[PDB]
């Protein structure tokens, strides 16, 4: 059993690692492949238990990655691409 | 530890707590065990004051 | 520094992950409740298979319980254990 | 390890490998990084032998 300062501790406002589709920060890049299809960002996520506040971002850095692409029929490269991260995460109004 | 957690179900226990208050008070037993009785104390003052 | 492709890969390929979620998505039936916390880390299939064929899915299930603070507001509240349901394996199988 | 994942990055550029060689191949190379040159021969004899 998981005790209940652990839980609370674990579970409040903090920045987690968190699985993204690479298609939700690049909307506009739907003609492509790319592989991997999700990585991991550090992205704010947790309670504030509260109903007056909410888990957001205090202060964000961006993080580059190699990533492969595939225009489907014309060829593919790995290269570089830059990620959002929330590094610090605060309940607020 | 058991009393650690002990205390900290404790604080939450108080019913008159506000959201901002409990979070005060776990939080700082969280972050300093050895502060767990005295945090009782006070919240057990705050708790009493607002009664309703 | 620049992440390389090979851990890109190996780290977002479909694997059991640490995910936040909401208590009452868990328990649909107790929202006369209020929850502290209201979300718990439950061990959940993630990432991606790289393969339009295949999909991530739990291949291998198991409950982990909770002490959690049930408030009934205005009228209670008390510490009860409380399960949740945890992905113990996964893996990318077709749809 | 720069040298294990340019071997990996050689690999998953090889055009006519399907996504299920390109992720036996990759992850390999990840179980047994000391395997990199080996599966990049191996993947590179499947690659042409897999040509149109």
Redesign the interface.
Known sequence: VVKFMDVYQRSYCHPIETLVDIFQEYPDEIEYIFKPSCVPLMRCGGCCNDEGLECVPTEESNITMQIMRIKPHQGQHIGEMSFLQHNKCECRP | K?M??AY??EI??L?NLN??Q??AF??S??DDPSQSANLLAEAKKLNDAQAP
């Open positions: 058991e650690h957690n900290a179900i939450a226990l019913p959201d901002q409990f979070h776990i939080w037993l969280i």
